[PDB]
Amino acid sequence: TTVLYYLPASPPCRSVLLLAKMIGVELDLKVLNIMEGEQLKPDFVELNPQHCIPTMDDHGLVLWESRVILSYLVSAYGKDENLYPKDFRSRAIVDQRLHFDLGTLYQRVVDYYFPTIHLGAHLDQTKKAKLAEALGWFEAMLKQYQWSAANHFTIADIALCVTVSQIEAFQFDLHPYPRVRAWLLKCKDELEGHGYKEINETGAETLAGLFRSK
Amino acid sequence: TTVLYYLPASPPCRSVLLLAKMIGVELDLKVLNIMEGEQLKPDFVELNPQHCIPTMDDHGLVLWESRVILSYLVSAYGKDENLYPKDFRSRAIVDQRLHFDLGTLYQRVVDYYFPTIHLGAHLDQTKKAKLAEALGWFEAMLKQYQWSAANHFTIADIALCVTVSQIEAFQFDLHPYPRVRAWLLKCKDELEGHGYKEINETGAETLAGLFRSK
Ligand SMILES: N[C@@H](CCC(=O)N[C@@H](CS(=O)(=O)O)C(=O)NCC(=O)O)C(=O)O
Ligand SMILES: N[C@@H](CCC(=O)N[C@@H](CS(=O)(=O)O)C(=O)NCC(=O)O)C(=O)O
Ligand SMILES: [Cu+2]
Ligand SMILES: [Cu+2]
Ligand SMILES: [Cu+2]
Ligand SMILES: [Cu+2]
Ligand SMILES: [Cu+2]
Ligand SMILES: [Cu+2]
């Protein structure tokens, strides 16, 4: 069992949970109510300077950053699946897509949504266009392969499946992007028997409810 | 020879150049004047949807995102050096640090600097504190090892060496962070004989001059 400090609703935490459930990595869960500021306590901050979740403690091996935990868990406990290609030529593409998500797609989701979700800010028209612009890039990126970075399912699809599944929950109009919508369906049917509903569908809603609420 | 569409001053491009020079990967350079908008032309946008640099074309293998190019080049042409540890337990830490840089340290550098550098915006006091807060996290991260993610020099140090060397050029007060300053010296002496001055020192200045100018 690997320890994971997380928050169900958290998009980054859900990537880790899905993968873990998919490759059978048993998780000893520790909810960290970031809202009540539990991550700021001395002993967690001593554990992780940046005091964020998800944070993994795999038998002493501490590590954070959802996407780094994906590659890691997969290298440490993966099997017959190939959610993280050994061939570097292929792994590069998967890496590229995971960086795309962290530094572009998701970042822009957080920018147009979380503020209003954290302080009731007003939506920013310009900040919504940038998100659309990125979805556009992704749309172009979905042309080459059947999946997002390989012609088979990989951890990139998981990361990105969580970012887009959230966008969708926020009821963002994804009509302009049919490849994204098409790949999004595949990701759901692919994860359905691995806790998608239980883990990601229930999480996107509460997170969307908190956005629509206020 | 691997093709690289780049811009000398660009921090992401300089990571790639340093590594490449360090591990002897010959580069066929193609300057892309982003200022004049050359990256927006049809044939580059056809090459890279997100039309950004650095962009590598290694014998047909197209790929972008400076940090993904680092791991790649190192897996494709590395040698006696170990700038990217095979042991996954170790690679994780190096990955974590590269994500830290992309999604945190560097991102916050771009936020407090490039606007005024792109549109003469005024510096944001709050946005400068966040950068300080991240340097603080990094400072805590430099405790465990002699270098940033290993007890030996890796590609993380290169990525991060470029981000902090830029911060420094912007004359940011780094007095509060002695570990960062200490590691920063090691990185310079480490890269000095691999084009540091020629590649990164000359690049940080022009970029700083463009910030101080306006
Ligand atoms: N890039 C990180 C982002 C993680 C992150 O932002 N976590 C938030 C919570 S959530 O938005 O994902 O729900 C957090 O821990 N925030 C508290 C803190 O940073 O102190 C990842 O991919 O794991
Ligand atoms: N995360 C990317 C960022 C690259 C980036 O932002 N490149 C800029 C130029 S620079 O700021 O690095 O100099 C670019 O190509 N901009 C043009 C564009 O995005 O259209 C990386 O690490 O490579
Ligand atoms: Cu265990
Ligand atoms: Cu098509
Ligand atoms: Cu289910
Ligand atoms: Cu060649
Ligand atoms: Cu010390
Ligand atoms: Cu030199």
Question: Terminal CA-to-CA distance of chain A, rounded, Å?
Answer: 38
d(CA A176, CA A179): 9
What is the CB neighbour count within 10 angstroms for residue A105?
A: 22
Distance from CA of B144 to the nearest CA of A (A): 12
d(CA A160, CA A80): 22
Q: Which tokens in the block code for residue B18?
A: 């340093």
Q: Which residue has the tokens 């958290």?
A: A10
Chain-centroid distance, C-alpha A189: 17
Which has the closest alpha carbon to B188: B207, B162, B151? B162
Q: Contact B71/B86 with Cβ under 8 angstroms? A: no
Classify B171 in phi/psi space as left (phi over 0), alpha (psi -120 to 50) or beta.
Answer: left
DSSP secondary structure string for all residues of chain A = -EEEEE-TT-HHHHHHHHHHHHTT--EEEEE--TTTTGGGSHHHHTT-TT--SSEEEETTEEEE-HHHHHHHHHHHH--SS-SS-SSHHHHHHHHHHHHHIIIIIHHHHHHHHHHHHHH-PPP-HHHHHHHHHHHHHHHHHTTTSSSSSSSS--HHHHHHHHHHHHHHHTT---TT-HHHHHHHHHHHHHHGGGTIIIIIIHHHHHHHHHHH--
Same domain, B209 and B131: yes
Pairing of strands A61-64, A55-58: antiparallel
Same domain, A98 and A200: yes
Question: Terminal CA-to-CA distance of chain B, rounded, Å?
Answer: 38
Q: Is B75 a catalytic residue?
A: no
Q: Contact B31/B10 with Cβ under 8 angstroms? A: no
Same domain, B66 and B93: no
Classify A153 in phi/psi space as left (phi over 0), alpha (psi -120 to 50) or beta.
Answer: beta
Same domain, A48 and A95: no
| Ligand 2 atom at shortest distance from the alpha carbon of B40 | 20
Same domain, A61 and A155: no
Closest by Cβ to A137, choosing from B50, B67, B76: B50
Helix (H, G, I), strand (E, B) or coil at B123: coil
Which of B25, B44, B78 is the C-terminal boundary of a domain?
Answer: B78
Pairing of strands A2-6, A27-31: parallel
Same domain, A42 and A130: no
Helix (H, G, I), strand (E, B) or coil at B102: helix
Q: Which domain holds residue A36?
A: 1-78
Specified resolution (Å):
2.5
| Ligand 1 atom at shortest distance from the alpha carbon of B103 | 1
d(CA A67, CA A99): 9
Same domain, A25 and A117: no
Same domain, A112 and A207: yes
What is the longest distance spanned by two Cα atoms in chain A? 47
Q: Is A203 in the pocket of ligand 1 (CB under 6 A)?
A: no
CATH number of the domain bearing residue B205: 1.20.1050.10
Q: Which residue has the tokens 């306590």?
A: A41
Q: Contact B207/B118 with Cβ under 8 angstroms? A: no
Same domain, B122 and B170: yes
Residues facing B64 on adjacent strands: B55
Q: Is B85 in the pocket of ligand 2 (CB under 6 A)?
A: no
Helix (H, G, I), strand (E, B) or coil at B99: helix
Same domain, A143 and A153: yes
d(CA B151, CA B144): 8
Containing H/E element for B31? strand B27-31
Query: B211: which DSSP letter?
Result: H
Same domain, A3 and A109: no
Torsion of CA B151, B78, A89, B25, to 10 degrees: 130
Q: Is the peptide bond before B54 cis (omega within 30 degrees of 0)?
A: yes
Cβ neighbours of residue B151 closer than 8 Å, sequence gap 6 or more: B145
Q: Which tokens in the block code for residue B23?
A: 């591990």
Q: What is the domain count for chain B?
A: 2
d(CA B74, CA B104): 23
Distance from CA of B74 to the nearest CA of A (A): 10
Distance from CA of A210 to the nearest CA of B (A): 24
Helix B155-169 and helix B125-141: axis angle, to 10°? Answer: 140
Which of A46, A78, A110 is the C-terminal boundary of a domain?
Answer: A78
CATH number of the domain bearing residue A69: 3.40.30.10
Q: Is B103 in the pocket of ligand 1 (CB under 6 A)?
A: yes
Please give the radius of gyration of chain A, using alpha carbons only, rounded to the nearest integer.
17
Which of B44, B78, B112 is the C-terminal boundary of a domain?
Answer: B78
Cβ neighbours of residue A60 closer than 8 Å, sequence gap 6 or more: none
Q: Contact B160/B148 with Cβ under 8 angstroms? A: yes
Contacting residues of A for B76, CB less than 8 Å apart: 88-89
Which residues of A are marked as active site? 10
Q: Which residue has the tokens 């880790």?
A: A16
Q: After which residues is chain B broken (C to N over 2.5 A)?
A: none
Q: Cβ of B71 and A95 within 8 Å?
A: yes
Q: Contact B154/B82 with Cβ under 8 angstroms? A: yes
Residues making up chain B, counted from first to last: 214
Ligand closest to A56 (CA) is: 1
Containing H/E element for B171? none
| Nearest Cα residue to atom 1 of ligand 1 | A65
Same domain, A94 and A73: no
CA-based nearest residue in chain A for residue B46:
A140
What is the longest distance spanned by two Cα atoms in chain B? 47
Q: Which residue has the tokens 């503020």?
A: A115
Geometric angle at alpha carbon A160, from A16 and A137, rounded to 5°: 160
